[PDB]
Structures are given as structure tokens and as C-alpha cells.
Amino acid sequence: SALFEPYTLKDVTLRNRIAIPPMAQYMAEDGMINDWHHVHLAGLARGGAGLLVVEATAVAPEGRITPGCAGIWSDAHAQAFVPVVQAIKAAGSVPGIQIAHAGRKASANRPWEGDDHIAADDTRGWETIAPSAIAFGAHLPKVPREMTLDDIARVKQDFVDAARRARDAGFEWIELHFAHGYLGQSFFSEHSNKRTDAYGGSFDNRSRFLLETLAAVREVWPENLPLTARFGVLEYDGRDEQTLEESIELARRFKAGGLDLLSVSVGFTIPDTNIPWGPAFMGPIAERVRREAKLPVTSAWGFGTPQLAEAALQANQLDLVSVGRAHLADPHWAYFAAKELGVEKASWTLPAPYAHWLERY
Amino acid sequence: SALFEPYTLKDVTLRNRIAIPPMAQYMAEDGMINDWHHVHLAGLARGGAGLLVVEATAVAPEGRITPGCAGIWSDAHAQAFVPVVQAIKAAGSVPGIQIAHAGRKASANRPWEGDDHIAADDTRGWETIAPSAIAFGAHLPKVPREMTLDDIARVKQDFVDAARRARDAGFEWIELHFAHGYLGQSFFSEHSNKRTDAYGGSFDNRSRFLLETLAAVREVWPENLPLTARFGVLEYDGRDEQTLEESIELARRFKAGGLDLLSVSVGFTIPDTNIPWGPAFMGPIAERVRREAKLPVTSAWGFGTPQLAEAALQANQLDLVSVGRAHLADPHWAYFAAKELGVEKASWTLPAPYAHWLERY
Ligand SMILES: Cc1cc2nc3c(=O)[nH]c(=O)nc-3n(C[C@H](O)[C@H](O)[C@H](O)COP(=O)(O)O)c2cc1C
Numbered sequence A, B: 001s002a003l004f005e006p007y008t009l010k011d012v013t014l015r016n017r018i019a020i021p022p023m024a025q026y027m028a029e030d031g032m033i034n035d036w037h038h039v040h041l042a043g044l045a046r047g048g049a050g051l052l053v054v055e056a057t058a059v060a061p062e063g064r065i066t067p068g069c070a071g072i073w074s075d076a077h078a079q080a081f082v083p084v085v086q087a088i089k090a091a092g093s094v095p096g097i098q099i100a101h102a103g104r105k106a107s108a109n110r111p112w113e114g115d116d117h118i119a120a121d122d123t124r125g126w127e128t129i130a131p132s133a134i135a136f137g138a139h140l141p142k143v144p145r146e147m148t149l150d151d152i153a154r155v156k157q158d159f160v161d162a163a164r165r166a167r168d169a170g171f172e173w174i175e176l177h178f179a180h181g182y183l184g185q186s187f188f189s190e191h192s193n194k195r196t197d198a199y200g201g202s203f204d205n206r207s208r209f210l211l212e213t214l215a216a217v218r219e220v221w222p223e224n225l226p227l228t229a230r231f232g233v234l235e236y237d238g239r240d241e242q243t244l245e246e247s248i249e250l251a252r253r254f255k256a257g258g259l260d261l262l263s264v265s266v267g268f269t270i271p272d273t274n275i276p277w278g279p280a281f282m283g284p285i286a287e288r289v290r291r292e293a294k295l296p297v298t299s300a301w302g303f304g305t306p307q308l309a310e311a312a313l314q315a316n317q318l319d320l321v322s323v324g325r326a327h328l329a330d331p332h333w334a335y336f337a338a339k340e341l342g343v344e345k346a347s348w349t350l351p352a353p354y355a356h357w358l359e360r361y
């Protein structure tokens, strides 16, 4: 099976091609993770996936999506990850982390607590920042504050400090969250970036925040550990061919700037779009980015059907398959997939205290 | 669904009828549990089962099955359970523990490390104790030492101390391990108990260790928390009708002595038997014990098919359904079962950070 072949990137080897993508848990307090995250993550690592990417972790308090988001904006925040990292490694999975800044989509309620911007008089909320003072709209109506150049410098440095902290906590894989309409994606998109300084207008200017952040992170992140990003390459907004072309060009610049793999997603920059949801619908777009930028990729959405994950790898649409919700349903999805795809000794996808009893079960 | 109806016993209410039976992990060191157990147990509790019974936990070092068995023979051993108990409760499951003494089956290798008695010159091994100096045979050839009356007094007191420790660690449910050919089962069975003192010969004498242990435990275990035992009620050794009759009589004495529920099993006292394995094969025998002793019961073996669990409850064969290996395969089995049985809002069997995303998934 292609799904169960190892993958090496820089000095890191994944035992198979199953990646658990970042999935926000909304269970942290003042950015500090706790035993929710410890058990959730260690349990996933034991399920067999080759790579486990920790949820969007804010580089600064105002860059959380919600009051429940994880943060890494102080050394004490970083040190809370150390035991979790150590547990993921003990289980044989590679520990990764997505570092993030939610931009105009920040200061929102948890998804099961309204999913909308927090009310102005709610003591939990805060002012959001973005390239331009333009609201997302719909359930996220707050107009963000337009960033100053000093704000841009500060947020870049927050990404650097977050990457340095992630390194020192023992993570072996980092992902810059430049997707899903958050700060980085919103600098790239003409929908959200109306700046007239060096950080908006042209393709080079809209790319600038993302490229400078990548380069600044690269100074502290070890050259021998994968340096990755997640990026929305189209919006399904009626501008797809033009947007894809620019996004692929940026992917080429990321590669030239030391990016090892791109997690290919949709932008979600604005609400007025028509996304053609379906199982593995991202496969063809990820394949095009992979081919045209000559860069390894992962993608997600509906790969919890093991045969679809297998087909995507065999077609060279993807290098890793990211499987999200199926891992919430069943932390041991990798074992399920191994059985489905007829892997020999499938139960030994799991550790011995499980595997021994499930042999031919 | 019957499977998803709550159950109250003494002051404890289980949110559904799914019990996770004790399942040895073989991951402790000198009896001390560690982050293996913490994550394993907290993850199971979050999967939705109403009751989670911690694995066979030795009341004394020589009562471990193997060098990897959990123990509770000192206060430091007990205190290692406190954070795990607290995590199980946080997840809404009832924390239970099975306290145990492996008797003649002690001093064995882990199941994936030979599964047999440890060699005489292996520094990990130890002398086993039992009612009589008679080996199990087959892969457990060691002849145990015949217990003195002082040994019997000491082991009873070890059970008392273990129950007191379990209480003080915050467990809400206790199970005495009188099944599976370990010490208690071996006092009851004429195959293994050839004593000619007050602890062997007659039905009353063979029952005596089990009844005295129960009564001594009852002095320290709170009257408002379920007091349970696991007991093998037949052997499939060609003596089933006679053995069942005696076992049911002992179950009546257990009930009279304050036992709240009996986990009904097979004896496994000797190797030369013919067990008719099949899905839910224990259902009819558990039903007979339930009816003839007028005592609530659980049983196990093949109830990971949700419809079978449901049918057993609806037929009043069982009060709780114990589901073991299916929970090793999938810690979230309860969610799978809820979907299968058509429970409304099945995903909310899980906590919010999972349930929200799996609604209609
Ligand atoms: C609970 C949940 C939280 C998510 N949080 C993040 C996140 O922190 N960062 C991110 O880039 N994507 C996030 N996503 C998107 C997932 O990484 C993934 O792309 C998506 O769930 C599609 O894959 P699936 O169909 O396998 O679930 C989240 C998705 C879910 C279900």
C-alpha cells in the first residue's frame, strides 16, 4: 500500500503517509494547553499516523481565533507543550505544530457557542487586526484595525518567537498558517488587502508579508526539520484561474525560500463563494500545484475513505494524505485504514498492548 | 435504545449501559502506572462509555500476573492513580478498578513476550502462591507454594488495604477479581483446591476465602459505592451443571454479603476444557445467574456488535454490557454503537470538540 509507505523530508522520517492535520480544540485557557490536549494528542499519536500536526497555535493573544485557542506567545506557553511533544514521540509519530494568527477572523466564539464574532461588551473579546479595515461579513462582521508597519514588524517577530519556542519544545515539523482567511491569507488576497504601501497592491507586495514571515522563521527554525505552510490557493469566487496562477507563483517563491512541503487548501477569505464540496475534491488542484511548483503537497477533505487516500497517492496527486474528522470519530483510524487496504499485520499499526489482541480480529 | 439508558447502582449513575471491562496493559513498572495508562484510560473515558474499569491491579507484588502489571500495594502506588481517576471523572465516565491476585498464574511473561511462566533463573520472576501446590499446566507449569493460614490472613488484608487505597484515590466502583483461574477462582475450584483445612473440601470451605475477602473489603469500601466481583461460574470441563449450581449458590451468598453486581465469566481454572466460543455466547449463562441469584450481572465476549449488546439488554440477560477488544480497536466505540443503533444526536456521545464536527457525519 502507498498509504503505508514511509516518507522522508529533511532529517525526519514519517512511518506512513497519514497526516493528522491541525484541528483546533477550543479547550485552552489564556492560551495554555492542558490535559485535554495532552490526552487527545498522545491518543492520536498512538493510533498510528505518521505525522500529527498540533492545532492552530496563536503567535500572539489577539491572533487566537477564540478564547479557547492554544497559544505560544510566551516561554511558559511553550513549556506547556513539552510533555505532549514527548508523548507523541514516545508513540512513534512525528510531532508538528501549526503556528497561526487569525487576523480579522479573531475574537470569535467557539463553534458550538455561536461561531460568530464576540459581542462588543463581552469581556472576553478583543480588537482584531488585518491588512485593511474591511470585515469578512456574514457571522464575522467586526471591522479589523488596519495594521501599521510597526504592527507588521511585531507580528513577524511573534512568528519568529513562536517558531523558536516550537523548536525548543521539541517539535520536528512546523506549519505556517497562511490559509483559511486568517492573517497571512488575507495579506495575499485582493479581496481583503487594499493597502497602498509595500504590503499591498501588486502580486509582489501582497506576497511580501508571507515571504518575509517565512524568511524570518527560517532564521530560527532548524534547516534539518521540515518547514511547511498551509495556503489557500483558490477561493471558488469566479476568479479561480487567475487566483490559482498567482498562488502557484507564490508556491514557487516559497519553495525557493526553503519551504519543504505545502498543505494546499481553499482560501475562505470571503463568504460569497461556491465551493464544490465532495470526497477528495481537492485532489486535482493539489496535483496541479505539486506539478507546477515542483513542490511536495498534502491536502484534505474526505480522505477518511481509505481507498480514496490510496488512489490519491498512487496518482501522485499528493505526497501525504491529511485525514481530519475521521480521527475525531476514531483515534485509531490508521488501523482501520490498514485493515481496509489489506496491510499485513494491520493491528501492529497500534502499540503492542492493543495490537497483540487484535491480530486477526 | 436499551444500550443508551442510564443505570443507577447505590449512589452511582452510569450514563449508559456500556462498560469497559478490566483489560491488562502490561505497561507498569514495579506496579507503578504511568502515562501509558493515563492517556489510555482518559481517552476511553472520553469515548462515551458509562463505566471504565481499570485493569487487574495487584494487591501484593507476587499477585501480579506479569512484571508489567499495575499494583496498589502501597500508598505511593495508589497515589499514582489519583490524576487518572480525576481525568475519567472529568470525562463523565465512572471510574472503577479491579483488584486482583494472580495466584498460581503469577510470575508470567507478557502475552507478546511468550505468555508463559518466567524461567527460574530470570531475575524478574518470583514464587507463586495458591491454595494447593498444583500447577495449572500447559504454558504455566510452575508449581505454586501452598499458602499457610498466615498467608491467607495476609492476602485478605492486602485486599482490604487495596480497597481502602482505591477508595481514597477516588474510585467509585470496585471489582474483586475472583475469576479466570487466579487466586480467588482457584480457592473455589476443586481442580485447584485440595486443602484439608477450613479453606478446602466442602462447598462452604472452598467458598470461605472469597466470602471472607468480600466481607473484609466491605468494612473499608463505602456502602454507597458499588461493590462488585468477577467470578467464573463454569469451566466447560464436563462438570458444568454441578459447577453452575454451586457457583449460583455462591452468588446468592455474595448478594447476601453486600455484592451489588456480578461480572459473570468462565473459570479458566485448568487448560483441559472445551469452551464454545461465539458471539455473546455467555448471554444465556449470565441470564441464568441473574435469574437464579436475583443479582444484576454483566458479561463479555463478542458484544462489540452493537445489535448484540442491544438484544442482550432487551432480553434481560444482562444489566450492563462489557465491551473489551472493540475499545482497543476504537476508543470511541460507544459513538459507533450510538450511530448503529440510531441514537438521536449520536455524535454527542463524545465531548464537544469532537461531537460538534461529527453531527451528521
Ligand atoms: C475540529 C476541526 C478543527 C480544525 N482546525 C484547523 C486548524 O487548527 N488549522 C487548519 O489549518 N485547519 C483546521 N481544520 C481543517 C482540517 O485540518 C481539515 O482540513 C478538514 O477537517 C478537512 O479534512 P477532513 O475531511 O478529513 O476532516 C479544522 C477542522 C476541524 C474538523
Ligand SMILES: Cc1cc2nc3c(=O)[nH]c(=O)nc-3n(C[C@H](O)[C@H](O)[C@H](O)COP(=O)(O)O)c2cc1C
Pocket: A353, A357, B021, B022, B023, B024, B025, B055, B056, B098, B177, B179, B180, B230, B300, B301, B302, B303, B304, B322, B323, B324, B325, B326
Ligand atoms: C487486553 C486484554 C486484557 C485483559 N485483562 C483482563 C483483566 O485485567 N481482568 C479481567 O477480568 N479480564 C481481562 N480481560 C478480559 C476482558 O475483560 C473481556 O472479558 C474479554 O476481552 C472479552 O470481551 P471482548 O470480546 O469484548 O473483548 C482482558 C482482555 C483483553 C483483550
